[PDB]
């Protein structure tokens, strides 16, 4: 007689918290969605094995349109869990699902898990210096999203870093790479011409955070735009003005050009 | 030859990930630091019991001054773990420790865990709308730091939310409460008169994130400044203009007054 929103973490089934695992193991029914993000290091089977329960996977439509018809009814007389990649309430609209739970008379609890939003700390960039975030969405038809460009501009002007979540089309198995994101940004630049994103812009790419050997790379767009960062998921970051210690880390750990060590105070 | 940076998560001994626990159990030596923050819902003893390894606690000086003399030597010929509250490398000073490892010829890997930086998603506020973050420091003597006030001003005027980490005297285990933080901000306002923080400002308090029963409250300073939010730790957020969905969550889940639907959206 309760609904748990449990995050599964960044990369594989072991990124779930012990708390989340112990609770999931005792739930009567377990649901999950895998369209908000990509866990490149595991499979449904491995997750099912770990929690020792059958997992019913829901599609975006099942959730957004029928969460209260598929999940909530069972949570009224059973302990139910709803699993999601990363943290269930980060860069998703799942928070609203707690309201549906309330109105249906179902108490809900949230169990957090490692999120890419904080995992970016592994790039060596100070977390507090990250400003507003944005998502680079695939253009479709005659529609070419550009809001993310303005976010970079606004943050950069304040000396803040910009985290760019990359698009995902789970049902089509399409995961935007940092390369594709850079290509899109260069096109927006040509259009708006704000000097925000060019071949000389310093960027940082983090691929498969959560794995033991994620790809962490820093350098100029002109040099990284055609580099292989390995399998998805990928995230792209456009740093603002760097502290010397941030630059040192990018050079030593992310292989950035040693010239960035010479910051322009 | 290997050093593992392992996050302990948000609140108690079960907030570590399954991955972190299993790796920690297999390490020859386990170190930990509790100066960047504390784990309020557990004890060193309960953490040791779960990991089944003796844990050597390091002070800020041990790490900042002697990390390469205390931890790295053992990591040269053994598998060593370095536990930290939250997500490793969110704390600004942690990143450079990976450079020390490199310099010492020691491999290092990061095992993530939930961080309050991403856990604030439980407030219903969209993660992408959070801007620069800041820490409210206790004033003392003739020193009255106020940079955090400016951070709120710059975020808010851009329509962004501001995450305020509250001061903590780790060694002394003393936590700044959201109440104390509100009183401080009102004092700074009286001095700067920027119209940034007043009795009419809408704030959100998140207490004991990670716990199954965190306190999540939203309302105007005039009404929350003397409210009891429960045991530490406390986090204070000053949201910017709200999306209606954010507001409805604050009302339905955080007990915010209906007034926010018309005044703060
Ligand atoms: N392990 C990982 N490595 C790199 N990027 C990741 C990632 N996990 C998620 N992302 C990024 O974030 C996007 C999903 S947004 C959903 C995020 C999730 N709730 C969380 O807490 O992490 C992906 O398309 C990708 O750009």
From Swiss-Prot, chains A, B:
InterPro entries the UniProt entry points to:
4pyrrol_Mease (IPR000878), 4pyrrol_Methylase_sf (IPR035996), 4pyrrole_Mease_sub1 (IPR014777), 4pyrrole_Mease_sub2 (IPR014776), Dphthn_synthase (IPR004551)
The entry marks the following residues as binding S-adenosyl-L-methionine, namely: 10, 87, 90, 115-116, 166, 209, 234
The record's section on Pfam families has: TP_methylase
Q: Which SUPFAM superfamilies match?
A: Tetrapyrrole methylase (SSF53790)
Q: Which GO terms fall under molecular function for this chain's record?
A: diphthine synthase activity
| Keyword vocabulary terms for this entry | Methyltransferase, S-adenosyl-L-methionine, Transferase
Note on file?
The diphthine intermediate is not stable in vitro and readily eliminates the trimethylamino group. It is not known whether the elimination reaction also occurs physiologically.
By what name is this protein known? Diphthine synthase
Q: Which organism is it from?
A: Pyrococcus horikoshii (strain ATCC 700860 / DSM 12428 / JCM 9974 / NBRC 100139 / OT-3)
């Amino acid at each position: 007689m309760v609904l748990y929103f449990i995050g599964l973490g960044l990369y594989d089934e072991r990124d779930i918290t012990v708390k989340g695992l112990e609770i999931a193991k005792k739930c009567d029914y377990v649901f999950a969605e895998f369209y908000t993000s990509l866990m490149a290091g595991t499979t449904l089977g491995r997750i099912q094995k770990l929690i020792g329960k059958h997992i019913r996977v829901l599609s975006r439509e099942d959730v957004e349109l029928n969460f209260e018809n598929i999940v909530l009814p069972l949570a009224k007389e059973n302990d139910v869990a709803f699993l999601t990649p990363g943290d269930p309430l980060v860069a998703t609209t799942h928070a609203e699902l707690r309201i549906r739970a309330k109105r249906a008379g179902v108490e809900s609890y949230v169990i957090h898990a490692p999120s890419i939003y904080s995992a970016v700390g592994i790039t060596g960039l100070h977390i507090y210096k990250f400003g507003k975030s944005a998502t680079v969405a695939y253009p479709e038809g005659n529609w070419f999203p550009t809001s993310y460009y303005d976010v970079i501009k606004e943050n950069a002007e304040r000396g803040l870093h910009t985290l760019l979540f990359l698009d995902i089309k789970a049902e089509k198995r399409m995961y935007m790479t940092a390369n594709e994101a850079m290509e899109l940004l260069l096109k927006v630049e040509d259009m708006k011409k704000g000097g925000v994103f060019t071949d000389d812009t310093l960027v940082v790419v983090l691929a498969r955070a959560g794995s033991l050997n994620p790809t962490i790379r820093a350098g100029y767009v002109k040099d990284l735009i055609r580099e292989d960062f390995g399998d998805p998921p990928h995230i792209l970051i456009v740093p603002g003005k760097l502290h010397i210690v941030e630059a040192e880390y990018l050079v030593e750990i992310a292989g950035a050009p040693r010239e960035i060590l010479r910051v322009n105070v």
